[PDB]
Design a protein around this ligand. Structure first.
Ligand SMILES: CCCCCCCCCCCCCCCCCC(=O)OC[C@H](COP(=O)([O-])OCC(O)COP(=O)([O-])OC[C@@H](COC(=O)CCCCCCCCCCCCCCCCC)OC(=O)CCCCCCCCCCCCCCCCC)OC(=O)CCCCCCCCCCCCCCCCC
Ligand SMILES: CCCCCCCCCCCCCCCCCC(=O)OC[C@H](COP(=O)([O-])OCC(O)COP(=O)([O-])OC[C@@H](COC(=O)CCCCCCCCCCCCCCCCC)OC(=O)CCCCCCCCCCCCCCCCC)OC(=O)CCCCCCCCCCCCCCCCC
Ligand SMILES: CCCCC/C=C/C/C=C/CCCCCCCC(=O)O[C@H](COC(=O)CCCCCCCCCCCCCCC)COP(=O)(O)OCC[N+](C)(C)C
Ligand SMILES: CCCCCCCC/C=C/CCCCCCCC(=O)O[C@H](COC(=O)CCCCCCCCCCC)COP(=O)(O)OCCN
Ligand SMILES: CCCCCCCC/C=C/CCCCCCCC(=O)O[C@H](COC(=O)CCCCCCCCCCC)COP(=O)(O)OCCN
Ligand SMILES: CCCCCCCC/C=C/CCCCCCCC(=O)O[C@H](COC(=O)CCCCCCCCCCC)COP(=O)(O)OCCN
Ligand SMILES: CCCCCCCC/C=C\CCCCCCCC(=O)O[C@H](COC(=O)CCCCCCCCCCC)COP(=O)(O)OCCN
Ligand code: HEC
Ligand code: HEM
Ligand code: HEM
Ligand SMILES: CCCCCCCCCCCCO[C@@H]1O[C@H](CO)[C@@H](O[C@H]2O[C@H](CO)[C@@H](O)[C@H](O)[C@H]2O)[C@H](O)[C@H]1O
Ligand SMILES: CC1=NC2=C(COCC2)C(=O)[C@@H]1c1ccc(Oc2ccc(OC(F)(F)F)cc2)cc1
Lengths: 74, 56, 54, 378, 240, 98, 39, 65
């Protein structure tokens, strides 16, 4: 299937502008920083929790290996 | 504007845009090599053979 | 992996100089790191005074 | 009329990479396919150059490689590239597989299983390549791993000895691994051709998981520019390693020639196999460990049947998203464990991580799909 | 045994990302190998030629080569002879095989030094702290004899006698030959021996970083331009 | 209650933020294909649009204003009737062929 | 009903199972007389 | 001729952190020294001593080379 019979669409208007009429980076920081924050707040409670737990299991288990290699008074 | 001058002079004809790029790469190669080299050899003053070779 | 020295060790069999292991005359690891005993291969005693290892 | 559309050869290239209707909204996660192609070309070129200088005799091999690094012109950069290249390939591979899982791309069954095979094939390739220098790790790594096939009852011993071509990993094994390592990338190229051929039947998935026929765009120039950008970033990365940190991802024992009499303190394979090493090491029994190792990879093939969600992609599946990232972190943990010596606490961390892995794929994420379904009144 | 003391991190003149090896230090460090280490330890991957352009002029290197006796291939009669070394000869093996080396060292084989920096975790930091790390056993420790106490070695019992101490050699440049100074210099040479490319690679690193500084925003800008058509577009649904 | 969780989940899912309705997100197997195919002009073009909209937003890594988000209460199952019947039909042909 | 009233591939897959058995046994090389029965 | 390393080692042993591991070594010397039948050594306490000294040494030593 190629452009021409992909699907059937009715009543939709697409307006756009030549790249040479426009800025490459419209309001890049003023819109973009807020947007990136928004994006991160959205995902961090899904993504970050596991990696926290990794860091912890790795912290703990690395130091449990430390301790067990030492001597204790007995 | 400068860019206007450049467009009409160099970039409009595609044969010319190419001729620009090969010639500019030539001067860029020489320039960039020479400058980055000097940057490295100043960052590493004294430590290179080419800095100490006068002694032998 | 080093070569045990024969007729030596706490167990009068094999003592590794390396990480200090002690094999008996049976080759069995007695005192040291060496995970398991010495490696017992496949032999057959062809003649009364001949042996084949392989 | 127009050559790009008619000519038998150009038509294909046009249909494949210029006028291909791509979704408007594929993310950076769809970069990886092209990048994998680059990885593959990269290895073949750097590989070919190395092979003009290397020898696969036990006696000459270690030194022939170091000869590349000392006396061949630019041999050093080429060699380090082919080695960091192998890492970049596995990064690209695991990212690529990630996207498959999260966005439900695996619904494209033929594409997907070809892909599993690509993975296996690249795995074989890199396993055998790592042996080629004949360092301590190369040798003892290849020995331990190939020996697992000994645990196959009835035929194990015979089978491993036939692979070796003798009674240990020795002269005959290295020479044949060189041969295999050379021809395998070629076969990978064809399989990859086919991988694409099937993808081109459906076109691409996208992050919404929702059909995108109402908003496709010609591949060129949107995705030509974007792949190039990605390739730059891959090159940035590759060369950062080669030029700043060439040994960062390797083991130093591989600078010590292979010695059949002195076993290294900790034997590990390359990092890209560590998760599977750790699963294998968790099982007491040796055939158990083998079948677990095989299943940790082949399970990829089953994931299509384990899909429960009425939605294709995890974009709108919060519970599934959490579980997905759990699996990812677990694989980071499995990797950590696999790089560690078999002692407390790591033995038990590893066992847990191994359980968690299979638990997630076979029970938890299926369930979550279903819980989500009920939360949506379907 | 099965303990720690992993090396601390000494601020080598070549630790820095864009920092080259100190070539004067390499020259001194060669001397340290030549006069001290080369009695026990091979370095099979260096030839006299490799010193040229690095720490020795071409004829200086030739002088150093001529100083050694090397065997050469069969003459007319079909006999082996000895000759003076050339640039083309590799730095000579101190014994004709490993078993010979063992007999001479109480059964321990001294590792070749070609890659030693590279084939030990910690590299220069490890090796430096090894040479300068020799101490008297702690209370309760008794080592088999001819194995020495060194906290930086695996197991702490090393079959190498402390090879390094003040005025152990004389420096061409006349730098104060203190123990720490000679351990630094030999380490520097040992890094170079393991990785001749260190300087070239670091130069390229710089040029790669520079080109990428140009090319990454450039191509990124190209991307945004093409895609601006799409980024800007506004959609309108208009059923009758 | 059950409904308290379902409402939280809906907002978490977040398809509403792109102005999609639940039925827009259903993965298209053969049954679903057919249900869509039986949609009347109004309902079909509406879907076409909602998805154009969402896809264009996905591209931009953007969402709608909250004012514009699909409300939990207002989200009708436009597709279920068409689909329930497509499936009833299939189940029938299955039955028959045994 | 009508599948189960298939199961006509059971006697055909019986003969295909002997082809699989005998085939693996031929390709791989005692109690068959003559052939290998007399090594 | 004085090795600047033996200088700096002495300077580093001044530090508070070092003195604490020095105490740990002292206590262990008594303990192992005074018994005739047990199996302890003081490797552990020595090693963490050297660790504290040597991280200190590293910072300073190189200046004077
Ligand atoms: C308590 C103390 C101890 C701490 C431990 C505890 C941990 C607690 C914290 C939790 C940490 C774990 C959770 C992860 C982070 C939180 C979530 C998050 O990432 O939110 C992003 C979140 C995701 O957005 P979204 O819309 O929800 O979904 C993303 C889309 O799917 C697609 O987005 P798109 O299509 O718009 O494309 C852009 C996208 C593209 O995303 C991708 O393609 C993914 C990967 C590519 C990165 C981006 C392209 C740049 C190329 C990178 C490589 C080039 C060389 C540089 C050197 C590499 C560095 C080592 O870029 C990103 O999203 C950046 C995230 C990349 C994260 C990579 C993870 C690091 C690996 C570490 C492994 C652990 C071992 C360490 C060993 C060290 C190494 C030897 O959104 C944003 O932040 C906005 C996205 C736009 C980017 C903003 C600006 C960043 C610049 C990007 C380029 C550089 C990225 C850095 C890469 C490597 C750094 C090391
Ligand atoms: C551990 C290993 C890691 C694992 C992975 C490793 C695997 C291998 C690598 C494979 C890579 C796979 C990724 C494929 C991606 C392909 C491209 C793609 O699809 O789209 C790009 C994807 C998103 O593209 P997009 O059109 O922005 O999409 C926006 C979305 O619609 C969303 O729209 P929005 O409006 O919400 O977006 C907000 C916007 C805004 O939020 C921000 O974060 C703003 C901060 C911007 C930073 C500076 C901008 C640079 C130029 C802009 C001029 C104004 O953020 C973004 O656009 C996100 C993209 C990343 C931000 C840009 C890079 C930050 C670097 C900071 C450097 C600062 C110095 C700059 C001076 C340059 C000269 C040396 O972005 C990336 O993944 C970043 C790639 C481009 C970065 C180039 C910028 C130059 C940076 C400095 C170069 C220095 C070189 C070395 C040192 C030099 C010494 C002389
Ligand atoms: C000479 C011997 C070489 C043998 C191998 C063959 C190589 C081909 C070319 C080599 C010489 C370099 C000259 C380049 C020709 C000029 C390119 C061009 O002519 O076409 C550009 C494509 O390049 C772009 O995008 C470029 C952006 C992406 C980066 C790709 C650039 C390729 C670099 C050339 C490699 C040189 C090989 C050296 C090997 C020793 C088109 O871009 P635009 O659509 O904005 O222009 C619009 C047209 N206007 C401006 C004239 C109105
Ligand atoms: C789906 C059901 C799941 C059940 C699985 C339970 C286990 C029983 C299965 C047994 C069959 C095993 C044959 C496949 C090999 C799997 C192991 C594997 O990944 O081997 C690769 C080589 O790839 C190779 O050897 C493969 C190269 C090309 C061969 C193509 C194989 C076709 C299968 C694909 C299925 C879609 C080597 O990786 P390693 O070096 O061992 O990894 C190092 C880890 N320490
Ligand atoms: C035998 C194979 C075994 C199984 C394969 C496992 C795969 C290994 C994993 C590698 C990473 C795969 C990436 C998965 C797809 C990314 C999905 C994603 O980007 O999700 C983001 C959050 O992003 C983020 O937060 C992006 C951060 C990326 C995190 C880096 C990954 C760490 C590497 C671990 C290596 C062992 C949310 O995006 P969406 O739901 O699309 O919504 C977009 C906004 N509306
Ligand atoms: C069919 C043609 C293929 C060409 C591929 C096009 C590459 C497109 C991307 C380029 C990335 C830009 C960064 C490159 C930095 C180049 C800087 C530079 O001059 O470095 C080179 C080494 O760099 C390097 O060697 C760095 C090069 C990194 C490119 C690796 C990617 C391609 C893999 C090649 C594997 C076969 C040599 O510098 P010097 O030795 O000082 O030589 C002085 C000048 N002649
Ligand atoms: C035997 C050994 C065990 C150790 C295992 C170690 C490795 C994995 C460990 C931990 C991962 C836990 C992930 C839980 C975080 C989920 C809760 C949360 O923080 O975020 C929820 C997401 O909702 C939701 O997703 C709803 C909550 C449902 C989450 C399911 C938790 C299952 C995680 C897997 C545990 C193995 C809310 O966040 P958003 O909806 O993004 O909105 C944010 C603003 N409210
Ligand atoms: C013979 C008296 C020697 C001289 C002179 C030098 N070294 Fe040595 N070294 C020797 C032996 C027998 C061994 C093996 C030690 C063992 O425990 O088995 C070594 C070892 C080294 C090592 C390896 C450290 C490790 O982790 O394995 C290094 C880095 C080393 N030697 C360096 C070295 C240097 C720099 C010398 C001159 C300054 C030097 N050695 C002299 C025997 C002898
Ligand atoms: C998927 C593609 C490939 C991968 C993943 C790959 C992987 C590897 C790996 C991991 C090594 C060990 C690198 C090292 O640490 O030294 C290696 C070495 C080698 N590879 Fe490949 N390789 C690939 C393709 C090729 C091809 C096509 C050739 C030759 C035609 C080749 C030739 C070599 C040679 C000669 C070596 C030995 C030199 C060296 O160790 O660097 N490779 N390969
Ligand atoms: C040599 C290795 C591989 C190469 C060269 C390769 C190549 C590609 C390319 C070019 C694409 C299209 C671009 C993209 O969507 O990223 C792609 C897509 C895909 N590949 Fe791969 N691939 C490889 C390995 C794999 C593996 C291992 C899997 C799965 C285990 C896989 C599954 C897929 C899937 C499902 C898609 C479709 C993604 C989508 O459209 O959403 N591939 N591959
Ligand atoms: C918590 C109880 C209080 C007393 C113990 C306190 C110490 C901390 C808890 C762990 C105790 C160590 O005791 C135990 O040792 C064994 C042997 O290495 C390891 O455990 C492992 O044993 C073997 C390893 O070959 C595996 O078959 C087994 O499946 C696994 O659990 C763990 O390290 C730990 O479960
Ligand atoms: C076809 C294709 N469809 C889609 C996407 C993205 O998603 C939409 C579909 C793509 O990114 C791509 C793609 C794939 C490879 C590529 O560059 C090559 C080509 C060939 C090559 O060598 C090889 F051996 F493989 F032939 C190495 C890299 C460029 C583009």
């Amino acid at each position: 299937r190629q452009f021409g019979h992909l699907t059937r669409v009715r009543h939709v208007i697409t307006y756009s502008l030549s790249p040479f009429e426009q800025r490459a980076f419209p309001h890049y920081f003023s819109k973009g920083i807020p947007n990136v924050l928004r994006r991160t707040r959205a995902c961090i409670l899904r993504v970050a929790p596991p990696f926290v737990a990794f860091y912890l299991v790795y912290t703990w288990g690395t130091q449990e290996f430390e301790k067990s290699k030492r001597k204790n008074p007995a | 504007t400068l860019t206007a001058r450049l467009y009409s002079l160099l970039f409009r004809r595609t044969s010319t845009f190419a001729l620009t790029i090969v010639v500019g790469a030539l001067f860029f190669e020489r320039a960039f090599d020479q400058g980055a080299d000097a940057i490295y050899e100043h960052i590493n003053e004294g430590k290179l053979w080419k800095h100490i070779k006068h002694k032998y | 992996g080093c070569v045990p020295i024969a007729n030596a060790g706490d167990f009068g069999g094999y003592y590794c100089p390396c990480h200090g292991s002690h094999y008996d005359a049976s080759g069995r690891i007695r005192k040291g790191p060496a995970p398991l005993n010495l490696e017992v291969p496949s032999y057959e005693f062809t003649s009364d005074d001949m042996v084949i290892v392989g | 009329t127009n050559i790009r559309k008619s000519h038998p050869l150009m038509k294909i290239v046009n249909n494949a990479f210029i006028d291909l209707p791509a979704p408007s909204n594929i993310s950076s996660w769809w970069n990886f396919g092209s990048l994998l192609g680059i990885c593959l070309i990269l290895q073949i070129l750097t590989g070919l150059f190395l092979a003009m200088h290397y020898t696969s005799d036990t006696t000459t091999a270690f030194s022939s490689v170091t000869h590349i690094c000392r006396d061949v012109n630019y041999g050093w950069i080429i060699r380090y590239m082919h080695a960091n290249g192998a890492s970049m390939f596995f990064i690209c591979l695991y990212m690529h597989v990630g996207r498959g899982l999260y966005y439900g791309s695996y619904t494209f069954l033929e594409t997907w299983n070809i892909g599993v095979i690509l993975l296996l094939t690249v795995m074989a390739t890199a396993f055998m390549g790592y042996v080629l220098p004949w360092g301590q790790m190369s040798f003892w790594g290849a020995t331990v791993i190939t020996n697992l096939l000994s645990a196959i009852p009835y035929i194990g011993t015979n089978l491993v000895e036939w692979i070796w071509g003798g009674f240990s990993v020795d002269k005959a094994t290295l020479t044949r691994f060189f041969a295999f390592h050379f021809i395998l990338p070629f076969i990978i190229m064809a399989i990859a051709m086919v991988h694409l051929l099937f993808l081109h039947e459906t076109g691409s998935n996208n992050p919404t998981g929702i059909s995108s026929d109402v908003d496709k765009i010609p591949f060129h120039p949107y995705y030509t520019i974007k792949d190039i950008l990605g390739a730059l970033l891959l090159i940035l990365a590759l060369m950062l390693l080669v030029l700043f940190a060439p040994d960062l991802l390797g083991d130093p024992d591989n600078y010590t020639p292979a010695n059949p009499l002195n076993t290294p303190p900790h034997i590990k394979p390359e990092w890209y196999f560590l998760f599977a090493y750790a699963i294998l090491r968790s099982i007491p029994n040796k055939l158990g460990g083998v079948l677990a190792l095989a299943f940790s990879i082949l399970i990829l093939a089953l994931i299509p049947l384990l899909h429960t969600s009425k939605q294709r992609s995890m974009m709108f599946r919060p519970l599934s998203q959490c579980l997905f990232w759990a699996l990812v972190a677990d694989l980071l943990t499995l990797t950590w464990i696999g790089g560690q010596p078999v002692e407390h606490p790591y033995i038990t961390i590893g066992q847990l991580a191994s359980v968690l892995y299979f638990l997630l794929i076979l029970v938890l994420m299926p369930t979550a799909g279903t819980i989500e379904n009920k939360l949506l009144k379907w | 045994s099965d303990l720690e003391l992993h090396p601390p991190s000494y601020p080598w003149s070549h630790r820095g990302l864009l920092s080259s090896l100190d070539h004067t230090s390499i020259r001194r460090g060669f001397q340290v190998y030549k006069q001290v280490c080369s009695s026990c330890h091979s370095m099979d991957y260096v030839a006299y030629r490799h010193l040229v352009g690095v720490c020795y002029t071409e004829d200086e290197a030739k002088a150093l080569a001529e100083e050694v006796e090397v065997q050469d291939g069969p003459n007319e009669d079909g006999e082996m002879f000895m000759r003076p070394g050339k640039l083309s000869d590799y730095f000579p093996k101190p014994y004709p095989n490993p078993e010979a080396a063992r007999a001479a060292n109480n059964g321990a084989l001294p590792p070749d030094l070609s890659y030693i920096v590279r084939a030990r975790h910690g590299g220069e930091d490890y090796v430096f702290s090894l040479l300068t790390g020799y101490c008297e056993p702690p209370t309760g420790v008794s080592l088999r004899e001819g194995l020495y106490f060194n906290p930086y070695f695996p197991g702490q019992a090393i079959g190498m006698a402390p090879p390094i101490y003040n005025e152990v050699l004389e420096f061409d440049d006349g730098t104060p030959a203190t123990m720490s100074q000679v351990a630094k210099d030999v380490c520097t040479f040992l890094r170079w021996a393991a990785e001749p490319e260190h300087d070239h690679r670091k130069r390229m690193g710089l040029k790669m970083l520079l080109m990428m500084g140009l090319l990454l925003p450039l191509v990124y800008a190209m991307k945004r331009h093409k895609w601006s058509v799409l980024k800007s577009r506004k959609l309108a649904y208009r059923p009758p | 209650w059950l409904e308290g969780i379902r409402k939280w989940y809906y907002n978490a899912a977040g398809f509403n933020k792109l102005g999609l309705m639940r039925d827009d997100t259903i993965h298209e197997n053969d049954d679903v294909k057919e249900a869509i195919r039986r949609l009347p002009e109004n309902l079909y073009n509406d879907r076409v649009f909602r998805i154009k909209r969402a896809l264009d937003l996905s591209m931009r890594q953007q969402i709608l204003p909250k004012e514009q988000w699909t409300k939990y209460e207002e989200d009708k199952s436009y597709l279920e009737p068409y689909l329930k019947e497509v499936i009833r039909e299939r189940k029938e042909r299955e039955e028959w062929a045994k | 009903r009508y599948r189960q009233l298939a199961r006509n591939w059971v006697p055909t897959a019986s003969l295909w199972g002997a082809v699989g058995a005998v085939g693996l046994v031929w390709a791989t090389d005692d109690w068959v007389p003559y052939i290998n029965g007399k090594f | 001729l004085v090795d600047p390393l033996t200088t700096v080692r002495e300077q580093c042993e001044q530090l508070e952190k070092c003195v604490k591991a020095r105490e740990r070594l002292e206590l262990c010397d008594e303990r192992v020294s005074s018994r005739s039948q047990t199996e302890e050594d003081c490797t552990e306490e020595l090693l963490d001593f050297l660790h504290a000294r040597d991280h200190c040494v590293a910072h300073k030593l190189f200046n004077s080379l």
